[PDB]
């Protein structure tokens, strides 16, 4: 069950050609937009989440 | 050194812009005709024969 | 709370063709467009003469 990173927690940066740059390991944030009032930018000096190359018809 | 413009796409480009280029000359002539009341040409138009003979 | 945002009612200025939320504006478009285009078209004709 190696995969240091998807072993959930340590950090894993991802750069791309087509898709957007990522950062994404494990620590909460999650049970946090629940006990609410966690703001966030709306694309303040930034990028864009979910990112693309997923569609349909 | 105009060979930069010599390939498939370029062909498709000029092709797409053909009907437009055509119409723009249709506007262009009728425009000169009517602004100079072209004797030679107008006579053929059915109406617009306001020059009897 | 940006969801309290209402877009003002416009019936007061809307062309008759575009008054019903029930139906497309797709249909009325050609005509509405045609009308205002015919207007300038003729205007140029007028300016031409």
């Amino acid at each position: 069950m190696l995969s240091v990173a998807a072993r959930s927690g340590p950090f894993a940066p991802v750069l791309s050609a087509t898709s957007r740059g990522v950062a994404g390991a494990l620590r909460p944030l999650v049970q946090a937009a629940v006990p609410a009032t966690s703001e966030s930018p709306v694309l303040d000096l930034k990028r864009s989440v979910l990112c693309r190359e997923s569609l349909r018809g | 050194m105009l060979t930069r413009f010599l390939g498939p796409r370029y062909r498709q480009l000029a092709r797409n812009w053909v009907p437009t280029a055509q119409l723009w000359g249709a506007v262009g002539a009728v425009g000169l005709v009517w602004a100079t009341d072209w004797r030679l040409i107008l006579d053929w138009v059915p109406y617009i024969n306001g020059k009897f003979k | 709370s940006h969801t309290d945002i209402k877009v003002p009612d416009f019936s007061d200025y809307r062309r008759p063709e575009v008054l019903d939320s029930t139906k497309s504006s797709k249909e009325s478009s050609e005509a509405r467009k045609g009308f205002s285009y015919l207007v300038t078209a003729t205007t140029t004709v007028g300016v031409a003469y």
Partner: protein, 105 residues
């Protein structure tokens, strides 16, 4: 190799000497007309080169100004003339043509 090539070589060493940039300490690449391909190649030059080339042209424009020319000793000796820009210019063009070909398909 023999008479034939040294002949063309000296035709050039002549035309070169004839061109006259040398007398203003220039180098053939210093005299190249700057266009896009050129401009980028100049960008791509390393610090030292760039720095050297600006002092060179600067000396020349200074000469050309006061209409003098450099002492004969210091003129630039043909084929002691380093063609410093060419490799870059070549690759800069090389590149453009690729997009150019890519643009036709």
């Amino acid at each position: 190799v023999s008479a034939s090539s040294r002949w063309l070589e000296g035709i050039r060493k002549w035309y070169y000497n004839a061109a006259g940039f040398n007398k203003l300490g220039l180098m053939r690449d210093d005299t190249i007309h700057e266009n896009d391909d050129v401009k980028e190649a100049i960008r791509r030059l390393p610090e030292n080169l760039y720095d050297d080339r600006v002092f060179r042209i600067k000396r020349a424009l200074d000469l050309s100004m006061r209409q003098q020319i450099l002492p004969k000793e210091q003129w630039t000796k043909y084929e002691e003339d380093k063609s410093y820009l060419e490799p870059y210019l070549k690759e800069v063009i090389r590149e453009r043509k690729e997009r150019e070909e890519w643009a036709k398909k």
